Symmetry: C3
Subunit: 260 residues, 3 copies
């Protein structure tokens, strides 16, 4: 089974994260499937929009696969590390992207949403960046995108406390576009895609590029955030505390941090 | 007939777009009227604020004049292309600007609100950026300003779908400052102006310059947005879709 | 007595401006105590967060001590107002706004990561009413932290926002009832200090674009603020402002 599925619904490509038994956590196989489907969407002029969703009724994406992290397995597209987490977060394409958040969207899952142009969410879905609670950071763009997409103070609380945010509160803040009845997020996301795909495709695509400040394929304003994220990650990996998140979980206990 | 009228109410200059039969659509005449007025406002120390509004009871500004566009007419101020659309959107002045939106404010009209410092709207007013439905884009600043002034996701849905936004919803998001009773927008805008003109003018003007990041009359942070809008728009006018979009009337896009 | 106090509550440093009789107005002694405490917070691995608050229950901070003499940290003028507003530290900061916060206190709130406020508190930048501007970061930060149009009204009118309205816009995190603002800030502090401190601290640095203890994106804001203040400080209007308040009369501005 591939880590993600891709199918066409008219002029929309639907990409589905396909690891429901692992709460659709992202590993390399997910990145290969999502990444390859996004690139097929970019080069097919018949595709006018993309929807990203998770298999089943429980999870959009629970985050980075923590068992893969403990096993020192790379999470990204083996052929395209430049596409970032899930082959998705640093993978600009011209076509509009919509996250159809069907359930739990925590950590990496919320970062998939931030990376998408638009978000529709099941009313039961929960958002958040709990990475800091287990000695990680939101390295898949979360750390510099959350304050671009939420008011500064609201973004900082979320980032520094790691506490979750309901779909309703996300929508109230303008972090997501709409909250829908349980079970209906895919149809709602296709209806949003149609409200876009009827428009002149070159116009929509020029609009997207200008709105993100894209020059020759690259979101140039994001580069300092990625560079700082990489720089920080390297110091964190060396720390004693870097051992403690996994160690605490393994020993069925609360972590005791040393700030070293 | 002049494309825009300018007059004084005390220490406020009121600029009125004056093509109500064309729903206050912007052409070169409007850009000349609005632009000359702003420059006069900039250089008269007695003018402490400016209010922009549209003639009549139905339209603030319907957008770029589509018949002018179809005839390949230049829409801007002939002597000041660098001021941009309506001689307004890239024409920074030190005096505070308030859009008094008396009605329809679509495309170019929403771009005039974005470019203004404050917005007070008639409850009937509609905002939106429908350029993408017509094979064009919001080239007068809208494509990069809308995501600066609304939450990213909200701005993005407005930009990509082209669908309108009510005045009430615009206020709820903080895109405009107030929504007022039908017919009252000009008086509301003047009352707001006086809450500003009572203050020390050099103070108000310095705060405006710091808040927008102005060095030598240029909003430094907007220049990449303009550069990208210009290069994208060049290619886009060469496409068939950019001709197919107007002249309808349900268009057929070939993505070319 | 010292201008501000610093005390530990577990892994939180509480910094209290210690001048209740003066409404906690900032002078040099305050800047010394606040600045020194932040620096102790920065270098002590046990301090995982910082709460800033005012002594007593009437005032968070009244602003610059109107009986002004330097007000900054004599050894660290680069930290700016109260040794606080241009003094990045790795540890998250929570303003516990326990009373009035017009002007300077709003600038301390803008500088902090998080804000908990008394429902009585008001947030505003009334400096434009007296001939000067919010020079302790307020002008450029208010537009970063409120929606553009809402920030511009606040800045140009000099009128206050209620704590509740500030919370509705996302400018502050929490509004509580008088007497328990510090309790509510410590509860917020604990929701952060429970987490891995190096991850929290790295997240803060990235979120603000920090390279070697400097918020690089703020520097043009500081530079423009100082440039503008230099012209404001010589103007006849900046004399007319306090001269008028003093004499119980309306000021007459010349825009010079």
């Amino acid at each position: 089974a591939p880590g993600a599925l891709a199918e066409r619904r008219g002029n929309v490509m639907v990409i589905t994260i396909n690891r429901p038994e692992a709460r659709n956590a992202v590993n390399a196989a997910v990145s290969i499937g999502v990444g390859d489907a996004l690139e097929e969407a970019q080069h097919d002029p018949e595709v006018r929009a993309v929807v990203l969703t998770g298999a089943g009724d429980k999870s959009f994406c629970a985050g980075a696969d923590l068992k893969a992290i403990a096993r020192r397995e790379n999470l990204y597209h083996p052929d395209h590390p430049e596409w970032g987490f899930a082959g998705y977060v640093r993978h600009f394409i011209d076509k509009p992207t919509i996250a159809a958040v069907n359930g739990t969207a925590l950590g990496g899952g919320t970062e998939l949403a931030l990376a998408s142009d638009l978000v529709v969410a099941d009313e039961r879905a929960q958002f958040g960046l709990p990475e800091v609670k287990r000695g990680l950071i939101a390295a898949a763009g979360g750390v510099f995108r959350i304050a671009e997409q939420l008011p500064r103070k609201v973004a900082m609380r979320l980032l520094l406390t790691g506490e979750p945010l309901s779909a309703a509160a996300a929508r109230d803040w303008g972090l997501i576009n709409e909250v829908v009845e349980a079970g209906s997020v895919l149809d709602a996301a296709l209806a949003l895609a149609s409200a876009i795909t009827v428009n002149a495709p070159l116009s929509v695509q020029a609009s997207k590029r200008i709105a993100y400040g894209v020059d020759d394929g690259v979101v140039v304003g994001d580069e300092p955030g990625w560079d700082r994220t990489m720089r920080e990650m390297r110091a964190l990996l060396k720390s004693e505390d870097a051992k403690e998140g996994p160690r605490a979980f393994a020993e069925k206990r609360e972590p005791v941090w040393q700030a070293r």
